[PDB]
Assembly symmetry: C3
Homo-oligomer: 288 residues x 3
C-alpha cells in the first residue's frame, strides 16, 4: 500500500521483465543465513535491489542485497537474498513490495524462509520448522502490510489467512523430508513474527509460548500476507537458530551473532531441502 501506487509495481515488474529473459515461477525469500541458497542457481542473473526501480534499497546490510533469478532444480526462480524487515525501518509496504512485484513477474508460488528462536522446548537448535501457521503480533496492532486502500487488482480487502501456508506443500515436504531420509522429521509449528530489533526477555519468551507460537522471528509474516492477498501459493520454513530462554535459570543466550547455526550445514541442509522441493511445486504448465 501507501507510497507505492499500483503502477509503481507494474513499472518495476515490466522493467525487470525487460531486463532478465527469465520468467520466474517460484519466488524464494532467503532468510538470514540461507541466502547462500542462491549459489544453487543456473542461468542466475543478479539484480541489486538498488538497480531495480522502486525497489527498497538495502539499509546497513546491503551486502547480499540482490535479487537473483535463474533456476532451481527445474523451476524458473527468483531468489531474494537478504529480505527487508520492520526493524530496519522499512514501512511494511516496502518490506513486502517485492512480493507484489514477484506476482506481477508471473511468480505463482512463494517459498519464504527465516531464522527464528525456538519456543517449543522440543525444538533442538539446528532444526527446520515447516511453517504451518503464524501469529501476526505487529498486525494485531495495525502493522499489517495490507493496511490502506485495497487494490482489487491484487486482491480482496479482507483476504483470509486461515489457510496461509499451503497444506499440500506441507505434506509434499513432510514427506520429502522423509523420502530423502533425514532422521528427525522436519518439524512444524506456528511462527510468531515479533518486530523490534532486540531479542525476547524471558518474560516475553513465555507470553509467546503461551500465545501458542513455536518459533519467534522478525519477518516473513508480512510477506506471507501480501502473497496470500495476491493468490501466491505459499509455504516456508524456519531455521531454529537458537532456543529462546523460557527459564529464569537463564545464564545463556540466543543472540544473532551466535547465528552460527545459520552458517552451519544446517543452512546448507535447509538449502538443498528447499532445492528439492522445487520438484514438488505445481508447474503451472502441468502437462496433466
Amino acid at each position: 500500500e501507501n507510497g507505492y501506487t499500483y503502477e509503481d509495481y507494474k513499472n518495476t515488474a515490466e522493467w525487470l521483465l525487460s531486463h532478465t529473459k527469465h520468467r520466474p515461477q517460484v519466488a524464494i525469500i532467503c532468510g538470514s543465513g540461507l541466502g547462500g541458497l542462491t549459489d544453487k542457481l543456473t542461468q542466475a542473473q543478479i539484480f541489486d535491489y538498488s538497480e531495480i526501480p522502486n525497489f527498497p534499497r538495502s539499509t546497513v546490510p546491503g551486502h547480499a542485497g540482490r535479487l537473483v533469478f535463474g533456476f532451481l532444480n527445474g523451476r524458473a526462480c527468483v531468489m531474494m537474498q537478504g529480505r527487508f524487515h520492520m526493524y530496519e525501518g522499512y514501512p511494511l509496504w516496502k518490506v513486502t513490495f517485492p512480493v507484489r512485484v514477484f506476482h506481477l513477474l508471473g511468480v505463482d508460488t512463494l517459498v519464504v524462509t527465516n531464522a527464528a528462536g525456538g519456543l517449543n522446548p522440543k525444538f533442538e537448535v539446528g532444526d527446520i520448522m515447516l511453517i504451518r501457521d503464524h501469529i501476526n503480533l505487529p498486525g494485531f496492532s495495525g502493522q499489517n502490510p495490507l493496511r490502506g486502500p485495497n487494490d482489487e487488482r491484487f486482491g480482496d480487502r479482507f483476504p483470509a489467512m486461515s489457510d496461509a501456508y499451503d497444506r499440500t506443500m506441507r505434506q509434499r515436504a513432510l514427506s520429502t523430508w522423509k523420502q530423502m531420509g533425514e532422521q528427525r522429521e522436519l518439524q512444524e509449528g506456528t511462527y510468531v513474527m515479533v518486530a523490534g530489533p532486540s531479542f525476547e526477555t524471558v518474560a516475553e519468551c513465555r507470553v509467546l509460548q503461551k500465545l501458542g507460537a513455536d518459533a519467534v522471528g522478525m519477518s516473513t509474516v508480512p510477506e506471507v500476507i501480501v502473497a496470500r492477498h495476491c493468490g501466491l501459493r505459499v509455504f516456508g520454513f524456519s531455521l531454529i537458530t537458537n532456543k529462546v530462554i523460557m527459564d529464569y535459570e537463564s545464564l545463556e543466550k540466543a543472540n544473532h551473532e551466535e547465528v552460527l547455526a545459520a552458517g552451519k550445514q544446517a543452512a546448507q541442509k535447509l538449502e538443498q531441502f528447499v532445492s528439492i522441493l522445487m520438484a514438488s511445486i505445481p508447474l503451472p504448465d502441468k502437462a496433466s
Copy 2:
C-alpha cells in the same frame, strides 16, 4: 488528537449545528451491514462526510459514507453510516473524529455497532453480542485514539475504560431483548479489536480466545475510547457474522464477502433492537 486542533472539532460541530435544525442526543455508528438502520429515521437529514468540513471523507467504500440525523423511536439521533477503520489507513484520530464532533453536537450517548467473528464457540453465527468489555490490542502497542497531548476540554489524560460500556444499558437491553421475547437472550462478551484488513489465522484465532475475547472485530474500540473520554454514555452490540476457525480441521471460512448474515434479517433484527433501545436511553430532559 494530532492533525485536528480542538477548534477543528468546534468548527465542524457549529457548521453541522448550523446546517441541520436537528440537535442529536444519541450518536449511532452503524457497523457493517447494519447501516440500513438509517432507514428507520424520520426528519432524516443526510450529510455526506465529504460535505461536512474537516470530516474524514470515505475511502474506497464511500458508498454509504453519510451522516444521517433525524429521529429514532423518540430520540433525536445522528447515525453514522459506514464508520472509519484503521485498516483503511485513517490515523485513529480521524477514525474517532466523529465521536468528538458528536459530543460537541450535544450527543450524550453513543451506541456503537459492528460485525465481528465468533470466538466463543457457543456463539452461533447470526447472534448479537452486547459488548460488555473490550481488549484493545492495537492500543497496547500505542494505537490508542487518545495518544498525543490531552485536551482537558474533552477530558482527562488517563481516562478509565474499566467501565466503558454502560452497565445500565446492558441491563436495559438484556431485559429489552427479553421484554421483546426474542428466544435466544442477547449474548454478551468481550469484543477484541484487531486491525489489519486480513482475517485471523487459526493460530491467531486461538490467542484471541486465550486472551479472553469472545468476538473479534476491526473497529469500535477507538470510538468507545474517545467517547468515554468525553463522557458519552456508551453501549454497543456486535453482530457475530461468522465463527472464527479455532480448529485445524479448518476447511471452512468466515470471509467478509460471506457477510450474508450482515444482510440477513439478522441485520434487520439488530436494527429494530437498536431502535427499541432508544426508549431506554436516558432522556437528558428526564421530566423526573
Copy 3:
C-alpha cells in the same frame, strides 16, 4: 534512531558536559510522583529539557520538565524529573533520547522508576516492585526504540534483553530493603509496558495477568531497551499506585488522579530507598 543522527547525541552530550562541571555516573529517571527524589541532591545543577539542545521539550506537563545533576548518597548523578512517554506523542526515539545522551555523558548505570498498576493480587497498593523483567507489548508490534538502522557506536543490531535488569542490583536491593529493615520485602515482578493514555479495562487487565505481567505501566521499557543497547547496567522499581480491577464486581478505580500513593511517603520511601542503593551501584573507580 530516526530523527536523531549519532552526532545529535554527541552535541547534546558535549553541550551538557560543557555546561555542568558534573560528570554523572548514575542516570535516574524519576517516575510519576517520585520526581521529588530530586530534592535529595547536592551540587544540584538544573537544566530544563527545553534549554538543552536536541532534548525533547516536555508537552503539557513541562512542570517538572528538568534534568537535575548533582549527587546522590555518594554518586555523581543526573536525574530526569518527568520522563517522556509514548502517549504524549513522542516517537520512541525521543522518549529514549535521554538515555543515549546519558551514556555519552559517561553514565554507566541507569535506575528507572515508574508508577504502575498492580496486576498481581498479592501486590498491596503502596508497594514497590523491583523490576525483574518486562513484557514489551508495544514492541511486539514494532514500537521498539531500536527500530531503524542500528548504530554500532551505541550497540548491536539485535541486543539481548533476556538479562535487562541487572541481577546484582536486584540482590543488592532485595538485601538493602532488608538491611534497612522495611517489613514487607521489596516485591518483584514483570513490568508490562502498555501505551495509550487510557487505563486498562477489566478485560485487558486479565490478558495482562495471563501474559504473566505483575505490574502495568506506560513507560520505562523503551528506556531499559536503549540503555541495555548501550551497555548501561540497569535496575528499576515500580511504585504500585493502585490495583488493576481484574474483577467484574468492579465498582472501584485505579485512575491517575488517585495517584495519592505517588504523593505519599510511599513516594518518599522509594526515594530514600533509591538514595540508599547509590552505595550499592559499582563505582567505575572500584579502588579494588
